[PDB]
Design an enzyme around this catalytic site. Structure first.
Site, PDB file in Angstrom:
ATOM      1  N   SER A  60       0.851  -1.191   0.000  1.00  0.00           N
ATOM      2  CA  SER A  60       0.000   0.000   0.000  1.00  0.00           C
ATOM      3  C   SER A  60       0.886   1.240   0.000  1.00  0.00           C
ATOM      4  O   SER A  60       1.874   1.299   0.741  1.00  0.00           O
ATOM      5  CB  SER A  60      -0.909   0.021   1.237  1.00  0.00           C
ATOM      6  OG  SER A  60      -1.733   1.185   1.261  1.00  0.00           O
ATOM      7  N   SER A  67      -5.895   5.957  -1.462  1.00  0.00           N
ATOM      8  CA  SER A  67      -5.902   4.491  -1.325  1.00  0.00           C
ATOM      9  C   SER A  67      -6.848   3.760  -2.262  1.00  0.00           C
ATOM     10  O   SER A  67      -8.059   3.764  -2.059  1.00  0.00           O
ATOM     11  CB  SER A  67      -6.202   4.079   0.156  1.00  0.00           C
ATOM     12  N   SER A  68      -6.292   3.123  -3.286  1.00  0.00           N
ATOM     13  CA  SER A  68      -7.112   2.380  -4.233  1.00  0.00           C
ATOM     14  C   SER A  68      -7.656   1.161  -3.529  1.00  0.00           C
ATOM     15  O   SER A  68      -7.281   0.027  -3.823  1.00  0.00           O
ATOM     16  CB  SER A  68      -6.287   1.958  -5.436  1.00  0.00           C
ATOM     17  OG  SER A  68      -5.875   3.117  -6.142  1.00  0.00           O
ATOM     18  N   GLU A 128       1.061  -9.028   1.043  1.00  0.00           N
ATOM     19  CA  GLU A 128       1.407  -8.364   2.290  1.00  0.00           C
ATOM     20  C   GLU A 128       1.096  -9.193   3.546  1.00  0.00           C
ATOM     21  O   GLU A 128      -0.001  -9.736   3.722  1.00  0.00           O
ATOM     22  CB  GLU A 128       0.719  -6.997   2.354  1.00  0.00           C
ATOM     23  CG  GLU A 128       1.339  -5.967   1.411  1.00  0.00           C
ATOM     24  CD  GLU A 128       0.304  -5.119   0.689  1.00  0.00           C
ATOM     25  OE1 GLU A 128      -0.513  -5.707  -0.051  1.00  0.00           O
ATOM     26  OE2 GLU A 128       0.311  -3.873   0.857  1.00  0.00           O
TER      27      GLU A 128
HETATM   28 MG   LIG Z   1      -3.970   2.993  -4.900  1.00  0.00          MG
END
Ligand SMILES: [Mg+2]
Ligand SMILES: [Ca+2]
Ligand SMILES: [Mg+2]
Lengths: 154, 803, 144
Positions: free
Chosen positions: B171, B230-231, B450
């Site tokens: 992220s 934040s996608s 992650e």
């Molecule tokens: Mg993004």
């Protein structure tokens, strides 16, 4: 495995050196290899250093009987060949046509291995007579052979 | 030449060359607060060395099994890392850390091309740079993201095939902005017409492919602790070209949206930007159309986490957003239909309800009335259908309690917003879906593998995909390596390209598998987490090697766990607590009806009942697609990595980077090449670097190499003879290097010495002379002293005076 | 030993030392001739220079004492060169300190004395020690 004549010739050197620093059966350790070269060997500080050789003038002396072994030791050493040499110079040859930057030669020689003093260098370059053509480089090949032929040719 | 358009790209060759390196001394030692450290080797008490730290210049204890080889300086900030003599976890963290600090963020590693997150804009993406990268082969020009793309395209044309460009990464790594720069590029080199008009371009599909990102970022992005926009969802975005090599049309496809976000927002966070653009009074005419009062502080579904965001102007992003909707051709009915649907969510969060009488009542209709109006349904029919639902069977009339209701109001929003989002991708997909298919270039941008303190169903979905997507590279690599060997008559018959990846993968997606299980345990009423786990454990616990139990939690600030999975990047511990809930997201099988039978064109479309769907089953299904597709492509891999938790440029953080590097792909990618034969010179370039390693052997290329090798007593199971290139086993070039150096010095010393010998031999002929000369002098001076001190003489030369 | 120049010389020498004029060398010679320009050798030194020769030392056993006493000598030309094997520029002069060390630490090494005695008068001049002159000296040609 020295012949009685080979060892006979060894005395001679040791004798002329015993003199040049005081005729007294001994030879400053710091000559050990300069005595070795006179007979034909081609020592290296370390070689010489590993058999009793000293660094300074006057830190040890050597009676021939003990100097002898010091010598036979340096007879079983690496005395690099033409091909070795060449390839070492070749690595500096950028193009491959056999030539090197006058500085390089000096540079290499004074910066590589541990040393070779510029004085010592000027002495050999002048001695052997390797001169850089009108450009400022030189064919080390026809120089190596010089340093190998030795002061007196054929 | 010097074209200051490489400033943040190139790196001076000369000005860089302008130290002394001991292979036998310089190495790398693990570091607790820097990951690794430069040092000098001192001694060895077997399997335990001692070394000095160049930094603070000290000493420490390191097991001779933890030190890693250090590359000379000649590999400083090295464009392509698959070339460094020693390629290890640390040798990379150095070239990456080294480059990034000079300003550079573009480093290759074979197929890879890692992009470090610059935390500042750069001259590299300007149109002039673009002309430089036009057509040029990756080697012949600094690493950079434009090269990754320009090549794909060039290959699409040349190879005549589907080029894909999966960009993975943690992220806040830069993937979102990158997928743009790849998109904002392809356009620039495959546009409509730039040759032969006034009243020409009357809109432009480019303008759309672009103007789309806003309508999406508005519902798919948000402010999280690593709050970029934040996608919060993943997106596969193919690009289609025409038979002339020009952009035709495009399309979207998304994966996993944080539905859990609509109704909750953790510490210092918000909700998808949109909710903050509505309550922005940027466009008042609409506050009535939605029925909202422009202050976020009010709405319960968004006043949980913060509201403000430094660089974001909730009241500007709305203006553009609208325009964005327009430039896309969204009809007022639509554009508005969306907002109605959107605002109606805020109101749901604004509906509260009113010990023994178990079934709960409402505490006013106000909002319930607004939720009905906004959705075109009976406020009564809605509140009534919620508190007392009627699900099918002689159907029953289940009852709900104060909590059961607040829980569905949220499921309403959660399931609407999700329905909503889907519809939106579809609609834009519709616009850009210009009717015209030659080929295409896809681009992936999902989270990455992650691993966290606490890993649950979400981390699962994600690591699973990357697991599947990693297995992709592995295979890609496979075919590629094989081609090489074969192309060099050196063919070897290794096989297992995608390894245990299958194990841990099938152990998740296959029949008896996890989700495979999870998906059934969702359709069984009285079944709690304990119900789950026992079956989860039974079926596989003890019966598999990829499924085990939690290990050594020496990281105190860690989170719980139940099972643990052997994923490539690391055996990830998980926590089923929830899953049954998180998977089968509920809703009133009763209230959905209403919304399907609403009077609003949209809402209705949203809940049309499959007439005549678990999170996992959907995803898995939509993932085979992606994969089936990806395999029908030609991969390219853009690995993104965040440098620190401070958005500060030039600030690396080894724990993080390494951390990333492992699950990144650049590592498991390196070790997969290890088993084969990495580093490989060409029989000529070779024969020139080590001809000094076997001088007595040389009497071309593959002839000499065949001799210097043999000449060195070279182990067969260590190298293989290519037909143009000499192959070498990982790190064996490091040995022939050290070996090479010791040998050069030795040979020079020989020479040097031979010179000294030369001189002396010459000065010999003189010391033999001089000796004698001084033999005289000394002696003839003694005589002079003896005689000039005698008597027979002082009495002899005492008469000469009269002679 | 010294041919004719010293031949017609040696004659009058012993002849001009020997007080009783008999051709037969004695000790009464080194008793009255001595106080001619200094202090006569004293009894002990008289016998020492007469004992060094066995038998009739009277210009027969005497022409053999100077023989082996000087026989071990080398030219004025031979030494002039000897000193030159250390002058490749031919400045006809060896530096001073060089020669001092050269006689002081190599070969038959000179001790503080031998040295003190030598350079006691050595032909030095501004750093350059003249080997050429020093040579004439030691022989006799020079200023001794
Ligand atoms: Mg993004
Ligand atoms: Ca001596
Ligand atoms: Mg008389």
């Amino acid at each position: 495995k020295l012949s009685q004549d080979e060892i006979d010739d060894l005395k001679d050197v040791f004798e002329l050196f015993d003199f040049w620093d005081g005729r007294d059966g001994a030879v400053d350790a710091f000559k050990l290899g300069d005595v070795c070269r006179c007979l034909g060997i081609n020592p290296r500080n370390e070689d010489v250093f590993a058999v009793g050789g000293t660094h300074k003038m006057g830190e040890k002396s050597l009676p021939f009987e003990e100097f002898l072994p010091a010598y036979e030791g340096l007879m079983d050493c690496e005395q690099g060949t033409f091909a070795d040499y060449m390839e070492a110079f070749k690595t500096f040859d950028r193009e491959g046509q056999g030539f090197i930057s006058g500085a390089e030669l000096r540079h290499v020689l004074t910066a590589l291995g541990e040393r070779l003093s510029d004085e010592d260098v000027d002495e050999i370059i002048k001695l052997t007579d390797l001169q850089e053509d009108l450009e400022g480089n030189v064919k080390y090949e026809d120089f190596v052979k010089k340093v190998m032929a030795g002061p007196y040719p054929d | 030449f010097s074209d200051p358009d490489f400033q943040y790209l190139a790196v001076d060759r000369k000005k860089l060359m302008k130290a002394a390196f001991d292979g036998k001394k310089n190495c790398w030692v693990p570091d607790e607060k820097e990951g690794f450290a430069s040092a000098e080797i001192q001694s060895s008490k077997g399997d335990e060395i001692t070394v000095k730290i160049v930094a603070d210049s000290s000493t420490r204890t390191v097991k001779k099994d933890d030190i890693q080889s250090m590359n000379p300086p000649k590999f400083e900030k090295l464009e392509d890392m698959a070339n460094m003599t020693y390629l290890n976890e640390a040798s990379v963290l150095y070239n990456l850390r080294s480059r990034y600090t000079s300003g550079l963020i573009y480093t290759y590693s074979g197929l890879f091309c890692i992009a470090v997150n610059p935390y500042r804009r750069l001259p590299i993406y300007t149109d002039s740079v673009i002309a430089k990268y036009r057509g040029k082969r990756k080697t012949e020009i600094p690493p950079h993201l434009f090269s990754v793309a320009d090549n794909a395209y060039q290959n699409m044309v040349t190879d005549r095939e589907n080029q894909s460009c999966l960009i993975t990464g943690e992220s806040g790594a830069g993937k979102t902005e990158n997928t743009k720069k790849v998109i904002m590029y392809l356009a620039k080199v495959a546009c409509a017409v730039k040759k032969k008009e006034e009243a020409s371009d009357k809109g432009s599909l480019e303008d759309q492919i672009i103007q789309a990102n806003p309508v999406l970022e508005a519902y798919g992005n948000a402010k999280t602790t690593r709050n970029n926009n934040s996608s919060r969802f993943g997106k596969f975005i193919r690009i289609h070209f025409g038979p002339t090599g020009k952009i035709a049309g495009a399309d979207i496809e998304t994966y996993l949206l944080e539905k859990s976000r609509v109704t909750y927002q953790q510490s210092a966070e918000r909700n998808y930007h949109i909710f903050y653009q509505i309550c922005s009074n940027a466009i008042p005419e609409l506050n009535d159309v939605m029925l909202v009062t422009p202050d976020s502080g009010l709405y319960s579904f968004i006043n949980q986490g913060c509201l403000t965001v430094d660089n974001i102007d909730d009241v500007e992003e709305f203006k553009l957003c609208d325009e964005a909707f327009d430039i896309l051709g969204f009809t007022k009915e639509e554009k508005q239909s969306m907002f109605k649907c959107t605002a109606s969510i805020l109101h749901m969060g604004e509906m509260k309800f009113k010990p023994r009488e178990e079934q709960a009542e409402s505490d006013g209709t106000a909002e319930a009335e607004k939720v009905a109006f906004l959705c075109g349904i009976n406020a009564g029919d809605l509140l009534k259908a919620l508190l007392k639902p009627k699900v099918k069977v002689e159907m029953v009339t289940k009852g709900q309690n104060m909590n059961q209701v607040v829980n569905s109001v949220g499921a309403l929003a959660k399931s609407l917003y999700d329905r909503m989002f889907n519809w939106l991708v579809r609609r834009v997909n519709k616009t850009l879906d210009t009717k015209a298919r030659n080929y295409y270039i896809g681009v992936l941008d999902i989270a990455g593998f992650e691993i966290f303190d606490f890993n649950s169903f979400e981390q699962l979905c994600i690591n699973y995909t990357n697991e599947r997507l990693q297995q992709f590279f592995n295979h890609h690599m496979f075919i590629l390596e094989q081609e090489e060997y074969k192309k060099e008559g050196i063919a070897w018959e290794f096989i297992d390209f995608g390894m245990d990846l299958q194990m841990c993968i099938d152990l998740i997606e296959k029949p008896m598998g996890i989700l495979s299980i999870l998906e059934e345990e969702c359709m069984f009423p009285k079944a709690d987490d304990k119900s789950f786990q026992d079956k989860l454990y039974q079926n596989h616990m003890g019966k598999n090697r990829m499924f085990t139990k939690p290990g050594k939690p020496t990281r105190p600030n860690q989170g719980p766990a139940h099972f643990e999975l052997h994923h490539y990047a690391g055996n990830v511990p998980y926590s089923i607590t929830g899953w049954l809930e998180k998977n089968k997201d509920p809703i009133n099988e009763n209230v959905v009806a209403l919304l399907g039978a609403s009077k609003e064109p949209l809402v209705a479309e949203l809940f049309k009942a499959p007439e005549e769907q678990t999170i996992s089953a959907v995803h898995r299904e939509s993932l085979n697609k992606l994969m089936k597709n990806l395999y029908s492509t030609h991969p390219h891999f853009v690995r993104c990595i965040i440098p620190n938790e401070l958005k500060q440029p030039g600030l690396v953080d080894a724990e993080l980077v390494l951390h990333q590097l492992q699950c990144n792909g650049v590592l498991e990618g390196i070790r997969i090449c290890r088993k084969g034969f990495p580093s490989r010179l060409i029989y000529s370039e070779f024969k020139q670097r080590y001809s000094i390693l076997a001088p007595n052997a040389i009497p071309d290329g593959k002839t000499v190499s065949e001799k210097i090798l043999a000449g060195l007593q070279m182990d067969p199971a260590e190298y293989r003879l290519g037909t143009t290139k000499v192959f070498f086993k990982a790190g064996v070039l490091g040995n022939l290097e050290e070996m090479r150096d010791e040998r050069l010095s030795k040979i020079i010393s020989m020479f040097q010495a031979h010179i000294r010998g030369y001189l002396i031999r010459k000065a010999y002929k003189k010391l033999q002379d001089q000796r004698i000369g001084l033999s005289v002098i000394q002696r003839n001076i003694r005589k002079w002293l003896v005689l000039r001190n005698w008597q027979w003489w002082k009495l002899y030369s005492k008469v000469k005076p009269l002679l | 030993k010294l041919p004719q120049k010293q031949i017609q010389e040696m004659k009058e020498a012993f002849s001009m030392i020997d007080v009783d004029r008999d051709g037969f060398v004695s000790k009464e010679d080194i008793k009255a001739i001595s106080e001619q320009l200094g202090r006569a050798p004293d009894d002990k030194e008289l016998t020492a220079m007469l004992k060094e020769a066995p038998g009739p030392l009277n210009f027969t056993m005497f022409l053999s004492i100077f023989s082996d006493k000087l026989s071990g000598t080398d030219s004025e030309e031979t030494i002039r060169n000897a000193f030159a094997m250390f002058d490749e520029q031919e400045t006809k002069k060896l530096n001073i300190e060089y020669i001092k060390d050269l006689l002081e630490n190599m070969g038959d090494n000179f001790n503080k004395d031998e040295m003190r005695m030598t350079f006691k008068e050595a032909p030095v001049e501004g750093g350059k020690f003249d080997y050429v002159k020093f040579t004439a000296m030691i022989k006799g040609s020079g200023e001794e």
